Amino acid sequence: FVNQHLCGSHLVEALYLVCGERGFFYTPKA
Amino acid sequence: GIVEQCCTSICSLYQLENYCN
């Protein structure tokens, strides 16, 4: 699921699944 | 940023993990 165009909720979902208990930062303006 | 690398273009696991804490 990671190797495609990922926008919005799709991108946030991928970060969530990939990063697991680490969590992540989602910075669309940076 | 992430939008340019994963939304406007195809994402990769390598790049996604750069955003994990």
Side-chain angles (χ1 to χ4, degrees):
Chain A
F1 62 77
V2 306
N3 300 110
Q4 55 179 311
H5 295 270
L6 300 171
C7 305
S9 68
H10 299 198
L11 180 50
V12 157
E13 163 175 308
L15 284 164
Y16 167 72
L17 290 171
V18 164
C19 298
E21 72 176 26
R22 295 177 276 184
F24 58 89
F25 44 103
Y26 173 60
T27 56
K29 214 83 271 171
Chain B
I2 192 174
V3 171
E4 293 67 34
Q5 302 313 325
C6 280
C7 172
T8 304
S9 318
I10 294 168
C11 205
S12 76
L13 174 62
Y14 182 101
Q15 287 198 71
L16 284 167
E17 285 198 332
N18 278 337
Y19 298 96
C20 303
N21 300 129

